[PDB]
């Protein structure tokens, strides 16, 4: 359609969009302190909508049919065990 001249200068300023386009110095490993502070997040179940429209103590499994059930079977008693239950069972 119409050709772009640029981003509005005001928007460049407000949002600090000027970024020296050499390679970044960021590290994903630096996210860890913030991640430890932060409650469990879902990719596509919005936290604020969950508070409004669901119960505060709701169990939630995101994309529960994404993959088959992840379990192992006890060799003693043949019980199917969730990954987070295996260590405790082995006792």
């Amino acid at each position: 359609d119409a050709e772009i001249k640029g981003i509005k200068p005001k928007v460049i300023e407000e949002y600090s969009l000027s970024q020296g386009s050499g390679p970044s110095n960021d590290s994903w490993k630096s996210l860890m302190s913030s991640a430890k502070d932060t409650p469990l997040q879902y990719d596509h179940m919005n936290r604020e909508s969950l508070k409004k429209y669901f119960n505060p103590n709701a169990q939630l499994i995101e994309d529960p049919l994404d993959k088959p059930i992840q379990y192992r079977v006890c060799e003693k008693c043949g019980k199917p065990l969730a990954l987070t239950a295996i260590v405790d069972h082995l006792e």
Partner: protein, 92 residues
């Protein structure tokens, strides 16, 4: 130069609008059945080429999955992206 794209994305993220667009697109694709169609296509393509190699499978799936997006979803989400860009770009 052509870091326009990356600066516009940064704006969209920081303003909260990228999330809106991304979720709106996902909700539409899911409801029209495209997510499950892409999963079928993928399985079918693994059988066809007798391979689970990601690079090989993606090269057959991605072009087809792009074309499977409905016209309604594609042109609705494009309009919604334009409208956000109209607020922040000067044209000539």
């Amino acid at each position: 130069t052509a870091q326009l794209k990356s600066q516009i994305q940064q704006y969209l993220v920081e303003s909260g609008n990228y999330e809106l667009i991304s979720n709106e697109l996902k909700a539409r694709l899911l409801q029209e059945g495209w997510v499950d169609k892409v999963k079928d296509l993928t399985k079918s393509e693994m059988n066809i080429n007798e391979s689970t190699n990601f690079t090989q499978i993606l090269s057959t799936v991605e072009p087809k999955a792009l074309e499977m997006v409905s016209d309604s979803t594609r042109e609705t989400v494009l309009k919604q992206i334009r409208e956000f860009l109209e607020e922040i770009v000067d044209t000539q």
